[PDB]
Amino acid sequence: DKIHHHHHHENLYFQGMNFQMNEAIQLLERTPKTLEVFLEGLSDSWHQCNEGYETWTVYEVVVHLIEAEKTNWIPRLRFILQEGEHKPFPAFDRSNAVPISERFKEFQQLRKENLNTLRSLVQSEADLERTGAHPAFGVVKVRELLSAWVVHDLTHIAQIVRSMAKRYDTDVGPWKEYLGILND
């Protein structure tokens, strides 16, 4: 006789903290070489695609990643460790012509330097609990900044990949819907 459960797998949709310094560094150290192998020597068509009107191009996403290496993660890590909660992070700020190959070189250099600084500043697991002040979010921990750093990379890789896939929305013909169905 046929039966079911109410909200059968409710309990499964809850998650603890999985951050590990070593494991985070494994990802962070790979993103630049991954983007270079993937995108280098592709036709410019691929570098200029987006997910539609008023969304960033692939090239612009890589520039954005470079900008965060300069102005975002490491500067806020330093600020946490130096200012603690006594001051909120400062606001940020305050040429598409450059070959994408020059961008890859820059991102790889900045990332390499940033991972050396990371290692200098966070020298034990106990340091992951040190707190600073976000202008909107309130008290934030080092582990949360670094996690967001790893997730930020991944989020923009996926952004890049979906932009490229969108180029062929019409081209795939009747495969379009099924191409949205995963795990089958």
Binding positions for a copy of itself, 52-91, rule CB under 8 A: 52-56
- Number of separate helices (H) and strands (E) present in the chain: 6, 2
CA dist 122 and 75 (Å) reads 13
Nearest Cα neighbor of 100 from 62, 65, 71, 69 is: 62
Q: Are the CB atoms for 44 and 57 separated by under 8 Å? A: no
Question: Which one of the spans 80-88, 101-109, 110-118, 163-171 is the region binding a copy of itself (CB under 8 A)?
Answer: 163-171
Q: Where in 118-147 is the site for a copy of itself (CB under 8 A)? A: 134, 137-138, 140-141, 143-144, 147
Name, in order, each residue with C-beta under 8 angstroms of 48's C-beta and a sequence gap of 6 or more.
57, 58, 59
Stretch that binds a copy of itself, among 19-27, 70-78, 107-115, 119-127 (CB under 8 A): 19-27
Contact residues: a copy of itself, CB under 8 A: 9, 12-13, 15-20, 22-23, 26-27, 30, 33-34, 37-38, 41-43, 45-46, 52-56, 134, 137-138, 140-141, 143-144, 147-148, 150-152, 154-155, 157-159, 161-162, 164-165, 167-175, 179, 182-183
